[PDB]
Structure 1
Amino acid sequence: AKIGLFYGTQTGVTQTIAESIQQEFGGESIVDLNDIANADASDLNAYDYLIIGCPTWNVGELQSDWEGIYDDLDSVNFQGKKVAYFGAGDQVGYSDNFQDAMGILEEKISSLGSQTVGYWPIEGYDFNESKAVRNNQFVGLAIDEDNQPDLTKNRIKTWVSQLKSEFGL
């Protein structure tokens, strides 16, 4: 209940990742798993620590459930909150828009006064452009189940270890 993880998913990949992240943190006593499809913008208010998960769809766009709540995000005050991000994407098929959704959400939420935590290296990927890159780092964990499924488990373990420090855990 300390950390609220909100994800959106179209073909279920982002939900599986969300479930692995909750698992690595220690389970339901540490992280609440919430499908953004069933949530209201104000649900994000109940947490001081947030994890936002979103896959990029339709060439650089938000997954539709995140799309639907996007304009309501202005009603939440993120001042003082630490927010981490993760996303699923396909670097080979969408080289010019890899993980754009994660970047779109981070730009919106950070502008509302939150603190981004959980930066990730871009070197383990091959892509041309991404809206989720700032000063040569991803603003969150990039997962690619389409082309790099073998790296997913270690990526999540490593990222969660580094987030524990950031969330005072």
Structure 2
Amino acid sequence: KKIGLFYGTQTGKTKSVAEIIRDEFGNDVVTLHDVSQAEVTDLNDYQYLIIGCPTWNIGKLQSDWEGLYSELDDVDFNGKLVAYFGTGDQIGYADNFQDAIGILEEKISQRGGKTVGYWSTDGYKFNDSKALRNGKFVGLALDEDNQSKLTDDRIKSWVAQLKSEFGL
């Protein structure tokens, strides 16, 4: 339909978060694509995109998003609105917190994607992040390992913001 959510997952947390994002948006709005089963051309099917990706192995892309990283050069994101979220561990990995979505966004916005859905760094404890854009996160940062009780409200709040930014 209108929003395509393309998520990568290893232990399933970003997946869970994606399911709640669909629930929050109201039913048919967001479709949930596991990028492990995706082709890079699937991104052509939407004008509004949500990109979901955890950071693994000290500052790296989740390996299914890594599998599509190079091929992002084969897609034109011009004219699309794009939002980002990920799961992360701010305590264990304070120098590389939410690096992944920062890596995806830098590439996608270079190919024409307009970023929406910036998120406040308030209430997170970390040192450095590739997701940082003029004092904000490039997208929604969830931490299921340390802040699981904050997740549901952070998504509900983020979804209401995206409706406004997507012009739904």
Q: Partners of 1:157 and 1:39 in 2: how far apart?
A: 27
Partner of 1:47: 46
> What residue is the counterpart of 1:143 in the other structure?
142
User: What is the CA-CA distance between 1:56 and the residue it aligns to?
Assistant: 0.3
- Partner residue of 1:83? 82
Aligned to 2:14: 14
What is the match of residue 162 of structure 2?
163
| One-letter amino acid matched to 2:108 | I
Question: CA RMSD for the aligned pairs?
Answer: 0.5
| Aligned twin of 2:121 | 122
* CA distance in 1: counterparts of 2:29 and 2:141, whole angstroms: 22
- Opposite residue 34 of structure 1, the aligned amino acid is H
Where in structure 2 are the equivalents of 1:28-67 lying within 5 Å? 29-67=28-66
Q: 1:84-103 deviations in whole A, cap 9, x for unaligned? A: 00000000000000000010
Amino-acid identity (%): 68
TM-score, reference length from structure 2? 0.99
Deviation at 1:10, TM superposition (A): 0.3
* Structure 2 equivalent of residue 23 of structure 1: 23
Report the Cα offset of residue 123 of structure 1: 1.3
CA–CA distance in structure 2, aligned partners of residues 107 and 35 of structure 1: 21
What is the rounded CA distance, in whole Å, between the counterparts of 1:123 and 1:167 in structure 2? Answer: 24
Instruction: Indicate the SS of the match to 1:50.
Output: strand
Find the aligned partners of 2:25 and 2:34 in 1 and give their Cα distance. 18
Cα distance in 2, alignment partners of residues 121 and 13 from structure 1: 21
Partners of 2:46 and 2:161 lie apart in 1 by: 19
Structure 2 residue 127 is the aligned partner of structure 1 residue 106: no
Distance in 1 separating the partners of 2:102 and 2:42: 21
State the one-letter code of the partner of 1:59: I
| Alignment deviations for residues 72-125 of structure 1 (CA, whole Å, 9 cap, x no partner) | 111110001000000000000000000000100000000001100000000120
Deviation at 1:168, TM superposition (A): 1.3
C-alpha distance in structure 2 between counterparts of 1:31 and 1:132, whole Å: 23
- Pairing 1:93–2:92 present: yes
Gaps of 5+ in 1: none
* Runs of 4+ with >2 A deviation: none
Letter of the aligned partner of 2:138 in structure 1? V
1:121, 1:17 → 2: CA distance? 18
Within 2, Cα distance between the matches of 1:62 and 1:55?
7
How far apart, in 2, do the equivalents of 1:83 and 1:31 lie? 13
Question: What secondary structure sits across from 1:142 in the alignment?
Answer: strand
